[PDB]
Amino acid sequence: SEYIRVTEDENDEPIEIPSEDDGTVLLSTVTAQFPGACGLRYRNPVSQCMRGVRLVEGILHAPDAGWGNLVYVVNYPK
């Protein structure tokens, strides 16, 4: 039951969005601040490549380590 930081552009200051009590994040929780959003990715700090977040059935799941304080960048389609 944390907040994760989410942004639509890595330079922009992110906003915190609430997780579920189980540590997941609903896609709907994201799309209420980022309408259109279809997913998330984040900059892996060890490789500096982008890394996708798992989404199954409208539910986002944390990286194995947890969400931490990383900045999650929203994906949009097309």
Residue numbers in the entry: 2 to 79
Question: What does the original paper state about this entry?
Answer:
The RNA-binding protein (RBP) TDP-43 (Trans-activation response element (TAR) DNA-binding protein 43) is mislocalized and aggregated into neuronal cytoplasmic ubiquitinated inclusions in the vast majority of ALS, as well as approximately half of FTD cases. TDP-43 is a nucleo-cytoplasmic shuttling protein comprised of two RNA recognition motifs (RRMs) that bind TG-/UG-repeat nucleic acids in a sequence-specific fashion and are indispensable for its roles in RNA metabolism. Finally, TDP-43 contains an N-terminal region spanning its first 80 amino acids, whose role in the function and/or malfunction of the protein remains unclear. In this study, we provide evidence that the physiological TDP-43 state in the nucleus is oligomeric and that this oligomerization is indispensable for the functional role of the protein in RNA metabolism.
To elucidate the molecular basis of physiological TDP-43 oligomerization, we determined the crystal structure of TDP-43 NTD at 2.1 Å resolution, which revealed an unprecedented mode of head-to-tail interactions between monomers generating solenoid-like polymers. TDP-43 NTD crystallized in space group P63 and two molecules (Mol-A, Mol-B) are found in the asymmetric unit, whose structures are virtually identical, indicated by a root-mean square deviation (r.m.s.d) of 0.612 Å (Cα atoms of residues 1–80). Crystallographic symmetry generated three intertwined superhelices of TDP-43 NTDs packed against each other, building a tubular superstructure. Within each superhelix, every turn is composed of 12 TDP-43 NTD monomers (two molecules per asymmetric unit) with a rise of 24.6 Å between two asymmetric units, a helical pitch of 147.6 Å and a radius of 34 Å to the center of mass, respectively. TDP-43 NTD adopts a compact fold comprised of a five-stranded β-sheet (β2-β1-β5-β3-β4) packing against one α-helix. The head region (on the right when viewing the β-sheet with the β1-strand pointing up) of TDP-43 NTD is positively charged and interactions are made by residues mainly from β3- (Asn45), β4- (Arg52, Arg55), β5- (Asn76) strands and the β3-β4 loop (Ser48). In contrast, the tail (on the left, viewing from β-sheet with β1-strand going up) of the molecule is negatively charged and is comprised of residues from the β2- (Glu17) strand, the α1-helix (Gln34) and the β1-β2 (Glu14) and β2-α1 (Glu21) loops that interact with the adjacent molecule. In addition, at each interface, β2-strand of one monomer forms a parallel inter-molecular β-bridge with the β4-strand of the adjacent monomer in which the main chain atoms of Glu17 (β2-strand) forms H-bonds with the backbone of Met51 and Gly53 (β4-strand). This interaction is strengthened by the guanidinium groups of Arg55 and Arg52 that form salt bridges with the carboxyl groups of Glu21 and Glu17, respectively.
